[PDB]
């Protein structure tokens, strides 16, 4: 490269990883110094062009030459953006003589982009344990029956005109004739989860647990809350919860863990004392008397049998959050003994909340996705962070969650359906997460992944809940048609991508299952050992990610997108480690020349595939490795 009226795109690069941004999570007064990489001597000038919400205008900040990388192949230019609490967006204008190129969240462009700019959100920090950990989601009733005395028995109670049923372990999740799918209980409880912490934290290595609802409710999924202040008797009691949390936080049964609970705050069950539709409790619920102490907690259109609810589900009356200072905002997150604060405070001290139906939370029965909804989550974040600045907040959302994250005042991240689950599914299994046929090439996969990452600030990207499957969609192994290797590949990608790897109980061994409720089968424990090849791989991959900070908070650079041979390679790197991941999708084995020079891996240095143990030597900026179909190598140094 040289000063020849031409900017060479191949040498350009910038993202907010350690080597290019000294303040990825800036405080309200923090200056942000950035570095732009280019081929050595390729440009004549560079500017950071940023939009400031403070004064509704663009601002140009020149860059100055800073240095060359260890291989002497690139230049590093640096610039500093003035500090202030205002949100800012930036892109780069790179010039060489009369030639100009632009660069933003989606890479290089010949024309100045109008979107996908990078983010600078002052005073927005997500928990670092979330960025660096591995999550394991458990649907309580289906994991492990640690206490048989609390098991819900068949016919114990009837709800919606149907009795409950107890199911034998390993039998179909579908209710037998006469029962309802939502009232089927296998017996899984909190004692069981505690007893299997060694399997989760030691055998596998995950250190973050995310549990579906566990508070008093009549259903087996428990999203129809009856009492937020107590564990459902079938799962145990509050003391059992205190012990489980203590055991999760313990280091005696594996590494220190973290607990994230499911917060169902958009609505309650119709059997909740506040509502009490079936007249089961003393007090006069909102449904029973217009003179109820909790009448304002809900929204009726025609009292008492016509009220706002979750998507028309009668058993799910919608909570009216009213305006700031309301009684509902008090019981949920403003009061000293609010639900959110209660569990974040001792003797519980949980580590976070997953926000159920977070997009609908509103006042007066509104559908959410509006100013009020965003205002409520702003107050919620302020409260939660006040109690514990390291308490996680992850909202449920299926599309682009930018509105609840990019403002830096609401959620730390979201259920990554749009930026992880869907693309991963369509690339590997060739189905959408609902199991309808839908496929994408490797280049489209890389593009999808980058475009969605660009929807979020860097810390949010690193905090996204990335799961292959969950309780509302079909199982990955079912979408894969039982092809376990597809799970192998998915795991390798997952454990090396941006965002929190999240294992939905069972996926580690290849558990199958169709749509709800078949996606909530009882866990087959005879499969929980290295004998299951997927379990053995999972254990190894978690150890690798726990080992390299670069895989959790390092930069991400696309290296190879080959649709002919189905090869996808990308680098994850920071100031210490450089990692080139090489994946092979749906094709026979291939020998790949990995361009590690793009990662500045020096010629003559050695790299080691952390999966196989094979070592290689960098020659002429390359590493030549063989990767079989539906597998991958993790070349690191
Ligand atoms: O009253 C008649 C009827 O009553 C009973 O229930 C019938 C319904 O039961 C089941 O649905 C349950 C579900 O099993 C529960 O888990 C619970 O659902 C909650 C989710 O689990 C949470 O993640 C959260 O989801 C909110 C999201 O909801 C929507 O997403 C849906 C997708 O669109 C869809 O493709 C698929 O993936 O499902 C999801 C979730 O349902 C919404 O679009 C999205 O924006 C939002 O984020 O909250 C949920 C509610 O708390 O409750 C459900 C309702 O009770 C069956 O799955 C359902 O088919 C059935 O209608 C009796 O069981 C039944 O016999 C009787 O006829
Ligand atoms: Ca040039
Ligand atoms: Ca039990
Ligand atoms: Ca009553």
UniProtKB/Swiss-Prot annotation:
Alphabetical list of InterPro entries matching this protein: Glyco_hydro_13_cat_dom, Glyco_hydro_13_lg-like_dom, Glyco_hydro_b, Glycoside_hydrolase_SF, Ig-like_fold, Ig_E-set
A GO CC term attached to the entry: extracellular region
Originating species: Thermoactinomyces vulgaris
Chief site of localization: secreted
Annotated substrate binding sites: 267, 354, 471-472, 516, 520
The enzyme's E.C. designation: 3.2.1.135
Cofactor(s) listed in the protein's UniProt record: Ca(2+)
Residues under site feature: Transition state stabilizer: 472
Family indicated by similarity: Belongs to the glycosyl hydrolase 13 family.
Function recorded in the entry: Endohydrolysis of 1,4-alpha-glucosidic linkages in pullulan to form panose. Also hydrolyzes cyclodextrins.
Binding site for Ca(2+) 1: 2, 4, 6, 42, 96
Name of the protein this chain belongs to: Neopullulanase 1
GO molecular function: metal ion binding; neopullulanase activity
Compartment list: Secreted
Residue numbers binding Ca(2+) 2: 145, 147, 150-151, 187, 189
Gene Ontology biological process: carbohydrate metabolic process
Active site residues of this protein: 356 (nucleophile), 396 (proton donor)
Pfam families in the cross-refs: Alpha-amylase, Alpha-amylase_N
Free-text cofactor note: Binds 3 Ca(2+) ions per subunit.
Enzyme class: hydrolase
Residue numbers binding Ca(2+) 3: 276, 280-281, 283, 288
Keyword field: Calcium, Carbohydrate metabolism, Chloride, Glycosidase, Hydrolase, Metal-binding, Secreted, Signal
Catalysed conversion reaction: Hydrolysis of pullulan to panose (6-alpha-D-glucosylmaltose)
């Amino acid at each position: 490269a040289a000063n020849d009226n031409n900017v060479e795109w191949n040498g350009l690069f910038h993202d907010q990883g350690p080597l290019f941004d000294n303040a990825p999570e800036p405080t309200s007064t923090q200056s942000v110094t950035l570095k732009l990489r280019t081929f050595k001597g390729d440009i004549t000038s560079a500017n950071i062009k940023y939009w400031d919400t403070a004064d509704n205008a663009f601002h140009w900040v020149p860059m100055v030459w800073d240095s060359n990388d260890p291989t002497g192949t690139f230049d590093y230019w640096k610039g500093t953006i003035p500090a202030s609490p205002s949100i800012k967006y930036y892109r780069f204008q790179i010039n060489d003589g009369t030639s100009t190129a632009w660069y933003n969240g989606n890479g290089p462009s010949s024309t100045e982009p109008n979107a996908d700019d990078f983010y600078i959100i002052p005073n927005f920090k997500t928990p670092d344990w979330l960025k660096n950990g591995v999550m394991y989601q458990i649907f309580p009733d289906r994991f492990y029956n640690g206490d048989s005395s609390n098991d819900v028995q068949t016919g114990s109670y009837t709800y919606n005109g149907t009795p409950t049923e107890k199911k034998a372990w390993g039998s179909s999740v579908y209710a037998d004739p006469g029962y309802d799918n939502s009232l089927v209980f296998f017996g899984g409880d909190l004692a069981g989860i505690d007893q299997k912490l060694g399997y989760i934290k030691k055998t596998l290595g995950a250190n973050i647990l995310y549990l579906n609802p566990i508070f008093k409710a009549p259903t087996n999924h428990k999203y129809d809350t009856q009492d937020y202040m107590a564990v459902d008797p079938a799962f145990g009691d509050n003391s059992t919860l205190q012990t489980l949390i203590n055991d999760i936080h313990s280091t005696a049964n594996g590494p220190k863990g973290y607990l994230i609970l499911d917060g169902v705050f958009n609505h309650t069950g119709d059997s909740h004392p506040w509502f009490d539709k079936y007249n089961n409790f003393s007090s006069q619920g909102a449904y029973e008397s217009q003179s109820s102490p909790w009448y304002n907690y809900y929204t009726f259109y025609t009292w008492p049998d016509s009220y706002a609810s979750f998507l028309g589900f009668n058993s799910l009356p919608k909570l009216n959050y009213g305006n700031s200072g309301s009684a509902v905002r008090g019981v949920i997150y403003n009061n000293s003994n609010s639900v959110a604060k209660t569990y974040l405070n001792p003797p519980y001290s949980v580590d976070g909340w997953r926000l159920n139906a977070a997009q609908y939370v509103d006042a007066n029965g509104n559908n959410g996705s509006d100013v009020t909804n965003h205002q409520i989550w702003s107050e919620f974040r302020n409260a939660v962070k006040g109690v514990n600045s390291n308490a996680a907040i992850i909202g449920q959302y299926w599309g682009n969650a930018n509105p609840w994250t990019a403002q830096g005042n609401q959620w730390d991240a979201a259920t990554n359906f749009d930026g992880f689950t869907q693309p991963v599914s369509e690339w590997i299994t060739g189905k959408d997460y609902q199991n309808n046929s839908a496929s994408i090439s490797t280049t489209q996969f890389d593009s999808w992944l980058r475009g969605t990452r660009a929807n979020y600030p860097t810390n949010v990207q690193q905090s996204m809940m990335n799961f292959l499957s969950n309780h509302d969609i079909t199982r990955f192994a079912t979408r894969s048609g039982g092809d376990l290797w597809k799970t192998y590949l998915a795991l390798i990608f997952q454990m090396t991508y941006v965002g929190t790897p999240t294992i939905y109980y069972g996926d580690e061994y290849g558990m199958q299952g169709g749509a709800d409720p078949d996606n909530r089968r009882s866990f087959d424990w005879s499969q929980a050992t290295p004998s299951n090849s997927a379990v053995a791989l999972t254990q190894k991959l978690i150890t690798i990610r726990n080992q390299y900070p670069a895989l959790r908070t390092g930069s991400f650079m696309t290296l190879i997108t080959d649709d002919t041979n189905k090869i996808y390679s990308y680098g994850r790197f920071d100031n210490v480690n450089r990692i080139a991941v090489v994946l092979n999708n749906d094709s026979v084995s291939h020998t790949v020349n990995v361009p590690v020079w793009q990662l500045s891996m020096p010629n003559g240095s050695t790299v080691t595939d952390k999966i196989t143990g094979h070592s290689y030597t960098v020659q002429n900026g390359m590493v030549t490795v063989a990767v079989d179909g539906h597998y991958g190598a993790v070349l690191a140094q």
